[PDB]
Structures are given as structure tokens and as C-alpha cells.
Design a protein around this ligand. Structure first.
Ligand code: HEM
Ligand SMILES: Clc1ccc(-c2cnc[nH]2)cc1
Length: 465
């Protein structure tokens, strides 16, 4: 047997001395150098096996997919999920929820209109809101979170909120804080010493409280559904879950009960709102930095879509340049740097090692997004990475923003459609500008952790003629 190489741990402190003040990612990337693509670091008591670069990650996640299909924990939010919900679930509970969760998001939303149709309609709402600002300088963070939320909201509660609704803004508010603290330095620390730190104060409490307030809201909404519920006509994700919960009333092994509903719906909000939203937010910071790319995108929007009909999803196969820019926004923006923790579902033999069942594995998505074996000049923005000589989109093995394998993002289809429809629909109707000149713009994340949080910035949206 034997675990993969690593620094010798110090019990109760692990490799805390072999870490890097920057954060967990720099700690992983630095150790990588000494010990290779696969290694074993200790986050307090916890032995974790880190994976690096397209090849390693792919061999594990794809090659031994079931073996690596387990879910670890995130110290700062486990107190909330405790293994419930379509993300943090495991074994048979997980397979049951994911299967349900895929099919269900696919066909139910407010209006029995398609996922694409809702995103199109949100985009239409977004455009109109932006006209109201008459091209004045704003911070798009709030709006950008608003439009992502409303997609999940339409899907899960079967209704969108008006951008200015106080229920909603309050919700977005709680949301807005938690997601950024999840990636704060403290929460990275809390990752190694939750045993200790779980006791004194810290941000894990405001994270914990805030998330609980959201859960309270999902609580209320469930009850309102539960009562108005009509079996003939499920309205959305929540009704579909109830109707299943009833089909299962006599099944003691069914995983479709209250906790999985709450924590699932929470997960579809946490995942759906936050990553897509900061991706868009980061994409537009790049468009301020590369007005030339922005302009080429707007021109393709012109040749293919035109200035009158709203962008539709299948316009994308006709628009490889724009498609490439979105790939290149995801790749560089690298919103989830060390993936979400996995575990092996069994003793596993891997690259001549043995990894014991249930050991947390960290597939470091970033080291594949910036893997030189697959991307020339990995730290610079170039839509070129995804274009061939003819300007056709060009698949690249190293690009796995949603991770790979059996746990690959359950929302990747929705997220990709959001990116494409929001990007094209804003640029169709608007030009962007910043006070800051391009050369001055600094893409350095304000916070780096389980997620990447891009810096805030001023931007104006100028209505097009
Ligand atoms: C827009 C950019 C997005 C990115 C880059 C992204 C990325 C990811 C990543 C890296 C994981 C971890 C996969 C793993 O290592 O096992 C994940 C999991 C997941 N994502 Fe996303 N996500 C995005 C948006 C969304 C959206 C909009 C939804 C839902 C509507 C969503 C739902 C989920 C769910 C449910 C999981 C857990 C799947 C499982 O464990 O079985 N994601 N995503
Ligand atoms: Cl701890 C954690 C887990 C999952 C996500 C996620 C999945 N898909 C989009 N965001 C973010 C943070």
C-alpha cells in the first residue's frame, strides 16, 4: 500500500508548517513542486490527497469514476448540510437525489416554459432594468446576482422576483455575505482546525446564521407549496418533490423527505446563484480590459443574430468566437480553484499508491485550467485557446471548469446557457465602459478560496443605436 508522498505531519497540526500564508490553493500548488502531481497533506487531523494537472485529475475522476465519486466536506458549511442535499449527499442518497434533480430541473419551472425560455425572459428583464440606469456608472454585482437567482427561483419556487423587491433584496443580501465569507481567509483556516476553532467566534457563525435564515425562507415556501399543491399540475421543482414524496409514502428507504428538500433547494441556490454570477461579473471585467475582444463579439452577434431578435441558445453553434470567449472567461476566471472535495468510495490503487476508503481527495481544477501541457501561456487571456485555424471552436482536454466524472456539475447545462444568453443579450443591446483604462485593470481576485471572488468595479452600460 502507502499514501502518496507528502511532508511529514505533526499530529494535531499536520502540515500546517508546510502551508502558505496565501491560502489553501497556493499551499497545494507550492507543495506540488516538491512532491509531484499527486500528494498527501494534512489539514489538522485530516489526511487529504491532492490531484494536479489535466492528466492526474482525468485519470482519477474519469478513469476510476465510481471509485472517486464520493463527496468530502467543507468545514464552514458542513454544520449546515451534514450530508444532506444533492451536493453533499453520498452513496445511495446522492444517486437518488442527483437522478431526480437532473430530470426535474430539465422540465419544470414557472410557466412550463423551458429553461432556455426563462433565461431568455430574465435577459429581457435585465436589459430593461439597465436601460433605466440611462448609462450611468454602476456596480453590476447586485444585478448580476439578481439575474442568476431568478433562474433558480423560477425553477425552484416557480416565480421570479422583481429586481427591487425587498423580500428578494434581503434574500440576495444574506446570500451576498455568506458566499464571500466561505472563501475568506478565516474559512480557509477553519478548514484545518474546525475541531478547535468551531468553539470561539469567527465568521463561521455569520455564515452559519445567514445560511439558516435562507433555509427558513425555503421552509416557508415549502409550506405554501404543500398547501396550494395540485397533483394534476406541479408548478415547479418543489411540487415535483412533494408529488414524489407522496408516491413514496410507503417506502422506508426513500430519500425524499424534508431535510433533503430543504438542503437540496438550498444547494440549487448556493450553486446556481454564486458561481454563474461571479463568472459573468468576471467576464465583464475582461471585456473592459480587452475592448478589442468585446468588439469582435458584438460583431459576431451582429452577423449571426442581428440587432432585433433576442439571442437564442442554438445561435451559439453559429458563433464560435463568442463561444471561445466564454470558454476563455471560464478557464482564466477559474471560479472554483480546488474543486469541491471528493472521497474515494473504497480502498483504491492509484498510480502505484493505495488510497483508503473515505479519504478526502482534492481535484485541483485550477492546475488543469492553467496546465501548460494544454494551454500555451496559461495566465494570459486568449480566446485563441479554443479556436482552430478556421475560427471553429476547438475542444481542449484541459478545460474542465465544472470538474469531470460522475459528480460533474449537475447544473452545467443551465450555467452554460446562462453565460451565453446573458453575455450575448447584454452586448447585443449595450456597449460597456469603465473610467479605468484597460491597461490598469487588475484581474486579481479579491478573495481566493473554495471559490474565487473577483474585485468590485465600476462599469457603465451604454444603450446601442
Ligand atoms: C456557472 C459556472 C458553474 C461552475 C463553474 C460550476 C462548477 C461546479 C464544480 C467545480 C462542481 C464540483 C464537481 C465535483 O468536483 O464533484 C460543481 C458541482 C455541482 N454544481 Fe456547479 N457550477 C456552476 C454553476 C452551477 C449551477 C447554475 C447549478 C445548478 C443550477 C450547479 C449545480 C451543481 C450541483 C447540484 C453540484 C453537485 C453535483 C454532485 O455532487 O453530484 N452549478 N459545480
Ligand atoms: Cl462548497 C461549494 C460547493 C459547490 C459550489 C458550486 C457548485 N456549482 C456551482 N457552485 C460552490 C461551493
Amino acid at each position: 500500500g502507502k499514501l502518496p508522498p507528502g511532508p511529514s505531519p505533526l499530529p494535531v497540526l499536520g502540515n500546517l508548517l508546510q502551508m502558505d500564508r496565501k491560502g489553501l490553493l497556493r499551499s497545494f500548488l507550492r507543495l506540488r513542486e516538491k512532491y509531484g502531481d499527486v500528494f498527501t497533506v494534512y489539514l489538522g487531523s485530516r489526511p487529504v490527497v491532492v490531484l494536479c494537472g489535466t492528466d492526474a485529475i482525468r485519470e482519477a475522476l474519469v478513469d476510476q469514476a465510481e471509485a472517486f465519486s464520493g463527496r468530502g466536506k467543507i468545514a464552514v458549511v458542513d454544520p449546515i448540510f451534514q450530508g444532506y442535499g444533492v451536493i453533499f449527499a453520498n452513496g445511495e442518497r446522492w444517486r437518488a437525489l442527483r437522478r431526480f434533480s437532473l430530470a426535474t430541473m430539465r422540465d419544470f419551472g414557472m410557466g412550463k416554459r423551458s429553461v432556455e425560455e426563462r433565461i431568455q425572459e430574465e435577459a429581457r428583464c435585465l436589459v430593461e432594468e439597465l436601460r433605466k440606469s440611462k448609462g450611468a456608472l454602476l456596480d453590476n454585482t447586485l444585478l448580476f446576482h439578481s439575474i442568476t437567482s431568478n433562474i433558480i427561483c423560477s425553477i425552484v419556487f416557480g416565480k421570479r422576483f422583481d429586481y427591487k423587491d425587498p423580500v428578494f433584496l434581503r434574500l440576495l443580501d444574506l446570500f451576498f455575505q455568506s458566499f464571500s465569507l466561505i472563501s475568506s481567509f478565516s474559512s480557509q483556516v477553519f478548514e484545518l482546525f474546525s475541531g478547535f476553532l468551531k468553539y470561539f467566534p469567527g465568521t463561521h457563525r455569520q455564515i452559519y446564521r445567514n445560511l439558516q435564515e435562507i433555509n427558513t425562507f425555503i421552509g416557508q415556501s415549502v409550506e405554501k407549496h404543500r398547501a396550494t399543491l395540485d397533483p394534476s399540475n406541479p408548478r415547479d421543482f418543489i411540487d415535483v418533490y412533494l408529488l414524489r414524496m407522496e408516491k413514496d409514502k410507503s417506502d422506508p428507504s426513500s430519500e425524499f423527505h424534508h431535510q433533503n428538500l430543504i438542503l437540496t433547494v438550498l444547494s440549487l441556490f448556493f450553486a446556481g446563484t454564486e458561481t454563474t454570477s461571479t463568472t459573468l461579473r468576471y467576464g465583464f471585467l475582461l471585456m473592459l480590459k480587452y475592448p478589442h475582444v468585446t468588439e469582435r463579439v458584438q460583431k459576431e452577434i451582429e452577423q449571426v443574430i442581428g440587432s432585433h431578435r433576442p439571442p437564442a441558445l442554438d445561435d451559439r453553434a453559429k458563433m464560435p468566437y463568442t463561444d471561445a470567449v466564454i470558454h476563455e472567461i471560464q478557464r482564466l476566471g477559474d471560479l472554483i480553484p480546488f474543486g469541491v472535495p471528493h472521497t474515494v468510495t473504497k480502498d483504491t490503487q492509484f498510480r502505484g499508491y493505495v488510497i483508503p476508503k473515505n479519504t478526502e481527495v482534492f481535484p485541483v481544477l485550477s492546475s488543469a485550467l492553467h496546465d501548460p501541457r494544454y494551454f500555451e501561456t496559461p495566465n494570459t487571456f486568449n480566446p485563441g485557446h479554443f479556436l482552430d485555424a478556421n475560427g471553429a471552436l476547438k475542444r481542449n482536454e484541459g478545460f474542465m471548469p465544472f470538474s469531470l466524472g460522475k459528480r460533474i456539475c449537475a447544473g452545467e447545462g443551465i450555467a452554460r446557457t446562462e453565460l451565453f444568453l446573458f453575455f450575448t443579450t447584454i452586448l447585443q443591446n449595450f456597449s460597456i465602459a469603465s473610467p479605468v483604462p484597460p491597461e490598469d485593470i487588475d484581474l486579481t481576485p479579491r478573495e481566493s478560496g473554495v471559490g474565487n471572488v473577483p474585485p468590485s468595479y465600476q462599469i457603465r452600460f451604454l444603450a446601442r443605436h
